């Protein structure tokens, strides 16, 4: 979770330049917290 939030804030500093389409992906990567934050989903994924 800390790694994801850190990457999003790194995107918050620098620029989504049109000559390098990398940094939009770290902004889109924020969604995966929606699994890790719910403890029930953490339990089920750890059971898998």
């Amino acid at each position: 979770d800390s790694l994801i939030v850190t990457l999003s804030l790194v995107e918050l500093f620098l620029a989504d330049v049109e000559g390098l389409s990398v940094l939009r992906s770290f902004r889109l990567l924020r969604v995966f917290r929606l699994v890790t934050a719910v403890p029930q989903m953490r339990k089920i994924v750890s059971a898998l």
Binding site: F13, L14, A15, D16, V17
Partner: peptide
């Protein structure tokens, strides 16, 4: 003067050298 980094840029006050106006001053790849 040119806009210092981390300041809300606009059409009339551009940023300084090495930055792109994207509603504020943002740096570029090293």
């Amino acid at each position: 003067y040119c806009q210092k980094w981390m300041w809300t840029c606009d059409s009339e006050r551009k940023c300084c050298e090495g930055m792109v106006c994207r509603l504020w001053c943002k740096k570029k790849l090293w």
